[PDB]
Amino acid sequence: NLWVTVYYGVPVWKDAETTLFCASTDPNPQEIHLENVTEEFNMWKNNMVEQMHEDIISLWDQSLKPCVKLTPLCVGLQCTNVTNNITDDMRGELKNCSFNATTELRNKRQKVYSLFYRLDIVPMVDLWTNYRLISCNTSAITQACPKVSFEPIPIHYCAPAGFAILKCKDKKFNGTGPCQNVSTVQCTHGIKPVVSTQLLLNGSLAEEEVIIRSENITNNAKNILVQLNTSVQINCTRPNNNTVKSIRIGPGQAFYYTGDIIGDIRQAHCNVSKATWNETLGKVVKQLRKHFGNNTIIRFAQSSGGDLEVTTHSFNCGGEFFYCNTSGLFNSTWSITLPCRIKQIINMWQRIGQAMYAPPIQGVIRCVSNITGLILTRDGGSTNSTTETFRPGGGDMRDNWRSELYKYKVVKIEPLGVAPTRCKRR
Amino acid sequence: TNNITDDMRGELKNCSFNATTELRNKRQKVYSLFYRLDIVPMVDLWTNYRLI
Amino acid sequence: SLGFLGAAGSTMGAASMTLTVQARNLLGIKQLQARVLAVEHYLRDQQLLGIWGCSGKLICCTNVPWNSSWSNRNLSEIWDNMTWLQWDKEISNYTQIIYGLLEESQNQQEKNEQDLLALD
Amino acid sequence: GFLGAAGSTMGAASMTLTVQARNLLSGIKQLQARVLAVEHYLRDQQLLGIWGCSGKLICCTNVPWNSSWSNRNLSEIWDNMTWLQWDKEISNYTQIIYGLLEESQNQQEKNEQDLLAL
Numbered sequence: 001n002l003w004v005t006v007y008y009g010v011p012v013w014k015d016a017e018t019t020l021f022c023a024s025t026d027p028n029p030q031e032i033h034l035e036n037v038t039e040e041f042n043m044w045k046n047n048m049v050e051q052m053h054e055d056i057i058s059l060w061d062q063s064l065k066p067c068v069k070l071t072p073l074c075v076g077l078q079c080t081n082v083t084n085n086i087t088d089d090m091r092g093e094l095k096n097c098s099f100n101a102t103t104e105l106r107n108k109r110q111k112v113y114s115l116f117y118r119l120d121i122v123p124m125v126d127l128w129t130n131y132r133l134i135s136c137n138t139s140a141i142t143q144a145c146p147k148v149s150f151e152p153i154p155i156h157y158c159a160p161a162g163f164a165i166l167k168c169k170d171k172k173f174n175g176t177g178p179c180q181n182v183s184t185v186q187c188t189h190g191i192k193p194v195v196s197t198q199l200l201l202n203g204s205l206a207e208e209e210v211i212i213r214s215e216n217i218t219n220n221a222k223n224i225l226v227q228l229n230t231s232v233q234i235n236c237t238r239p240n241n242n243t244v245k246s247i248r249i250g251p252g253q254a255f256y257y258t259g260d261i262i263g264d265i266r267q268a269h270c271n272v273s274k275a276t277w278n279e280t281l282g283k284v285v286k287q288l289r290k291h292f293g294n295n296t297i298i299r300f301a302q303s304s305g306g307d308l309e310v311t312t313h314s315f316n317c318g319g320e321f322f323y324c325n326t327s328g329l330f331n332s333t334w335s336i337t338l339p340c341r342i343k344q345i346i347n348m349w350q351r352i353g354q355a356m357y358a359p360p361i362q363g364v365i366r367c368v369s370n371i372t373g374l375i376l377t378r379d380g381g382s383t384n385s386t387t388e389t390f391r392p393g394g395g396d397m398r399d400n401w402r403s404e405l406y407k408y409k410v411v412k413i414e415p416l417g418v419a420p421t422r423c424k425r426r
Numbered sequence: 427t428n429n430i431t432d433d434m435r436g437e438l439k440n441c442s443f444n445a446t447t448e449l450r451n452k453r454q455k456v457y458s459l460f461y462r463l464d465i466v467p468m469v470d471l472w473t474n475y476r477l478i
Numbered sequence: 479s480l481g482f483l484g485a486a487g488s489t490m491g492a493a494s495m496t497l498t499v500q501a502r503n504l505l506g507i508k509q510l511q512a513r514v515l516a517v518e519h520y521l522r523d524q525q526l527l528g529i530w531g532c533s534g535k536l537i538c539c540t541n542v543p544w545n546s547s548w549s550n551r552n553l554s555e556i557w558d559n560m561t562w563l564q565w566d567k568e569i570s571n572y573t574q575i576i577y578g579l580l581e582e583s584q585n586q587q588e589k590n591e592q593d594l595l596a597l598d
Numbered sequence: 599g600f601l602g603a604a605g606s607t608m609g610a611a612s613m614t615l616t617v618q619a620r621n622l623l624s625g626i627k628q629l630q631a632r633v634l635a636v637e638h639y640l641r642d643q644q645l646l647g648i649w650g651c652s653g654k655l656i657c658c659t660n661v662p663w664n665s666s667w668s669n670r671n672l673s674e675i676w677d678n679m680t681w682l683q684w685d686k687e688i689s690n691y692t693q694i695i696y697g698l699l700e701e702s703q704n705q706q707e708k709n710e711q712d713l714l715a716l
């Protein structure tokens with residue numbers, strides 16, 4: 001009675017992993033809401049996070065190729081103390097280091113004197129030198145081009161023809177499971193590739209409430225990503241009127257360094273309010289209690305030691321990589337100012353062999369910045385769920401980008417299908 | 427300098443040279459064993475060979 | 479008027495009215511790989527329709543009868559009470575048998591038409 | 599020759615459609631150029647396919663001509679105009695015509711689906 005009828009253009013899809021376009025090529029966005037659908041999402045199996053990670057690494061590596069190498073500056077340094085007025089907390093933090101640098105001429109050196117942060121130098125004992133640059137015994141140092149900025153620029157990931165991106169609009173979406181309010185887009189919204197290690201800055205806020213996302217909430221080896229519904233503002237500054245000088249080290253190689261600091265030296269601090277931070281932590285704890293016992297005491301603590309790039313909270317305020325100390329922020333059991341250390345020679349992500357030198361920017365650097373999320377890690381159930389301790393632990397950078405790509409899934413369109421009809425060909 | 431057989435006489439040489447280090451303005455004295463086929467004689471002062 | 483995949487959650491007998499909306503949306507190294515793979519997927523689907531004798535059509539009727547072992551349902555529940563996604567899931571791993579039957583039926587039809595057109 | 603009939607009248611240029619055809623299909627820049635030519639060819643072939651004109655160069659349809667698109671008679675259109683001038687004259691309605699053509703095919707297959715269901 002019934003016959004096979006072939007249809008082409010069937011609105012069905014399968015989960016798939018394909019290559020996405022990076023648009024910024026400004027797209028004309030479209031969004032089609034899908035009525036009466038349910039789609040299973042899994043933010044921790046989303047290939048878009050791995051592809052975004054690879055794209056950011058490739059763009060970063062490409063940006064540093066046509067730039068000045070600092071190979072001739074891997075020389076011994078004669079470092080002494082800074083003669084300006086400093087406080088007790090900054091004793092030994094900044095050093096005045098002299099060295100012999102090359103010039104455009106191959107057989108004519110030049111004495112130089114430059115201020116360096118203590119974190120950027122390592123002791124090395126010789127008759128006339130005291131320190132060397134931290135990375136010169138591990139890898140070449142490449143100077144970032146001063147014409148190229150670091151500041152995140154929102155980008156869009158776009159599926160190729162034959163593929164589509166599904167967006168989950170459900171409130172209180174925990175990152176996995178079914179989603180009912182699902183729409184189809186060709187390109188994602190503008191996602192800022194913001195680089196941070198403990199707090200998520202300039203990201204997306206939750207529509208309804210604080211959302212706690214974990215691949216396995218009972219596995220203490222996985223990170224917990226907390227998205228806030230309200231932002232908490234961070235005011236960061238390096239209160240030092242830095243005077244930047246430069247020297248020519250090769251035929252086309254110009255090197256930039258700290259020349260001097262005008263006036264007294266004061267430390268580099270980020271201010272977060274106390275009323276809103278206390279409300280934020282109360283909300284986070286209230287949401288945590290829904291994944292643990294209702295009478296379990298939840299306490300926050302300082303991060304563990306080891307690997308300064310992880311133990312501190314990074315930004316890219318101005319053009320200078322801060323590294324703040326959240327120990328005074330999470331020291332509570334359920335304003336505020338954070339001493340931030342400055343480095344210039346940065347090994348970003350967890351790579352070894354590619355060292356980038358961030359040149360200083362003249363003047364003061366002050367930036368205000370929305371905190372939109374947190375990365376928390378649990379210490380472990382050593383008390384049998386009597387008391388739980390959470391720390392602002394670090395993790396791979398994928399966790400920050402996943403915190404934006406959790407709403408998107410890539411699906412492959414399958415235009416063909418078959419179905420019974422009474423239609424017989426002849 | 428070792429217990430070298432007749433077949434290996436002149437085939438392996440103990441050579442020393444001034445190599446650079448991770449620092450531009452430092453030098454180190456390094457010695458190594460090279461095969462004769464990797465070396466070409468050179469007439470100079472304080473040296474008598476170069477690498478091919 | 480619903481847009482691309484707008485009918486995806488609608489019933490099969492309603493979503494079948496929007497086949498042109500889906501069809502029109504099917505068309506540096508990474509960008510070329512994405513464009514070439516989209517072209518290859520389109521061309522494989524078009525060749526597969528051509529092998530079945532359905533070239534140039536979006537709704538193509540054939541001469542393969544429906545087996546009750548593939549889906550023991552009536553037309554009302556298939557077309558009016560379920561979506562194409564649920565149907566596609568229901569007949570998963572039965573499509574290769576259907577495709578083979580469609581290929582063989584078209585080969586037989588082409589031979590029969592050639593023999594009919596060979597009569598003087 | 600290729601585009602030789604571009605300056606001829608449409609009645610004469612319509613007989614050289616196979617001459618204009620075949621010239622549509624035949625280090626990274628050359629590969630991008632080849633992919634772009636293939637993409638444009640396939641977009642045009644899909645656009646013909648959704649109209650029920652697949653495999654044909656002269657395809658008759660069921661969409662009536664609207665006098666608001668052009669009020670010229672067939673003698674003036676086909677004997678006194680080239681394809682370039684005609685294309686310029688009706689460009690502002692081309693997509694509307696395409697939409698109507700698509701709609702006709704959407705009806706046509708359904709009618710055929712019903713006729714074969716008897």
Ligand SMILES: *[C@@H]1O[C@H](CO)[C@@H](O[C@@H]2O[C@H](CO)[C@@H](O[C@@H]3O[C@H](CO)[C@@H](O)[C@H](O)[C@@H]3O)[C@H](O)[C@H]2NC(C)=O)[C@H](O)[C@H]1NC(C)=O
Binds near residue numbers: 151317366369
């Ligand atoms: C999070 O977003 C805020 C808001 O965009 C970022 O702060 C803004 O950053 C821009 C770009 O660096 C600043 O513009 C700069 O201003 C200085 C002023 O001297 C100028 O010299 C630079 O050339 C550039 O124009 C802007 O001032 C700043 N605005 C505010 C209100 O803070 C912030 O950097 C972002 N945070 C992260 C971690 O990406």
Ligand SMILES: *[C@@H]1O[C@H](CO)[C@@H](O[C@@H]2O[C@H](CO)[C@@H](O)[C@H](O)[C@H]2NC(C)=O)[C@H](O)[C@H]1NC(C)=O
Binds near residue numbers: 084096113
């Ligand atoms: C860093 O050290 C340099 C010397 O290597 C200082 O430069 C000297 O500063 C004194 C200040 O009284 C001057 O009188 C000298 O003429 C300077 N010499 C040169 C060669 O510039 C520099 O001031 C030091 N900077 C800081 C911040 O302590």
Ligand SMILES: *[C@@H]1O[C@H](CO)[C@@H](O[C@@H]2O[C@H](CO)[C@@H](O)[C@H](O)[C@H]2NC(C)=O)[C@H](O)[C@H]1NC(C)=O
Binds near residue numbers: 076077098111
């Ligand atoms: C920078 O160059 C100067 C060149 O004068 C170095 O000073 C001399 O260094 C040699 C050894 O390299 C000593 O024997 C001389 O006595 C030094 N001269 C003086 C006046 O002190 C200086 O040491 C170099 N600095 C660094 C950090 O390498």
Ligand SMILES: *[C@@H]1O[C@H](CO)[C@@H](O[C@@H]2O[C@H](CO)[C@@H](O)[C@H](O)[C@H]2NC(C)=O)[C@H](O)[C@H]1NC(C)=O
Binds near residue numbers: 440
């Ligand atoms: C190659 O030559 C070097 C130096 O000419 C030798 O190194 C010395 O070896 C003697 C033993 O004969 C030691 O007492 C010295 O302390 C060594 N000096 C250094 C600087 O290492 C080396 O042993 C020779 N190797 C061979 C295989 O003949």
Ligand SMILES: *[C@@H]1O[C@H](CO)[C@@H](O)[C@H](O)[C@H]1NC(C)=O
Binds near residue numbers: 080091
């Ligand atoms: C610099 O001064 C501090 C105390 O002000 C002292 O502890 C430190 O050793 C000094 N460093 C040098 C290199 O003189």
Ligand SMILES: *[C@@H]1O[C@H](CO)[C@@H](O)[C@H](O)[C@H]1NC(C)=O
Binds near residue numbers: 122137138
């Ligand atoms: C480079 O020096 C630092 C100084 O502590 C050391 O930890 C590191 O292991 C050194 N690199 C290598 C490759 O040995």
Ligand SMILES: *[C@@H]1O[C@H](CO)[C@@H](O)[C@H](O)[C@H]1NC(C)=O
Binds near residue numbers: 174175176177215
């Ligand atoms: C998200 O919520 C759904 C609701 O049923 C639940 O089944 C799923 O396990 C949750 N996932 C996570 C990661 O909390």
Ligand SMILES: *[C@@H]1O[C@H](CO)[C@@H](O)[C@H](O)[C@H]1NC(C)=O
Binds near residue numbers: 169181
């Ligand atoms: C889906 O989310 C959007 C977000 O604004 C909302 O407007 C829409 O009503 C939601 N859909 C349903 C079915 O609730």
Ligand SMILES: *[C@@H]1O[C@H](CO)[C@@H](O)[C@H](O)[C@H]1NC(C)=O
Binds near residue numbers: 207209210229283
């Ligand atoms: C954020 O969530 C808290 C949860 O108590 C709620 O009180 C507050 O109004 C929410 N804010 C917004 C802007 O949704």
Ligand SMILES: *[C@@H]1O[C@H](CO)[C@@H](O)[C@H](O)[C@H]1NC(C)=O
Binds near residue numbers: 217219
């Ligand atoms: C993963 O989650 C399940 C859910 O109950 C849990 O039983 C399991 O122990 C978790 N994995 C680990 C490694 O703890």
Ligand SMILES: *[C@@H]1O[C@H](CO)[C@@H](O)[C@H](O)[C@H]1NC(C)=O
Binds near residue numbers: 232233235272368
């Ligand atoms: C400092 O922080 C508060 C709250 O975070 C913010 O409202 C204010 O505008 C900031 N002020 C400055 C001068 O950065």
Ligand SMILES: *[C@@H]1O[C@H](CO)[C@@H](O)[C@H](O)[C@H]1NC(C)=O
Binds near residue numbers: 235236237269271
């Ligand atoms: C941070 O707080 C300190 C405390 O006095 C203040 O001096 C500084 O101006 C604040 N920073 C900003 C950017 O407002």
Ligand SMILES: *[C@@H]1O[C@H](CO)[C@@H](O)[C@H](O)[C@H]1NC(C)=O
Binds near residue numbers: 312325326327328
């Ligand atoms: C942050 O400050 C606390 C104050 O006790 C200190 O113990 C901790 O080591 C500091 N963080 C880092 C990364 O040094």
Ligand SMILES: *[C@@H]1O[C@H](CO)[C@@H](O)[C@H](O)[C@H]1NC(C)=O
Binds near residue numbers: 241262363
């Ligand atoms: C630093 O001091 C110099 C003195 O000439 C002044 O011109 C400059 O504006 C100052 N910069 C800041 C950021 O205060």
Ligand SMILES: *[C@@H]1O[C@H](CO)[C@@H](O)[C@H](O)[C@H]1NC(C)=O
Binds near residue numbers: 202231370
């Ligand atoms: C930060 O939060 C405030 C709160 O209203 C918002 O108006 C502002 O645009 C946010 N800034 C950024 C850079 O996201």
Ligand SMILES: *[C@@H]1O[C@H](CO)[C@@H](O)[C@H](O)[C@H]1NC(C)=O
Binds near residue numbers: 435436437
């Ligand atoms: C070293 O080896 C060469 C190889 O022919 C030989 O001629 C020479 O005499 C040897 N010299 C010594 C000191 O053994």
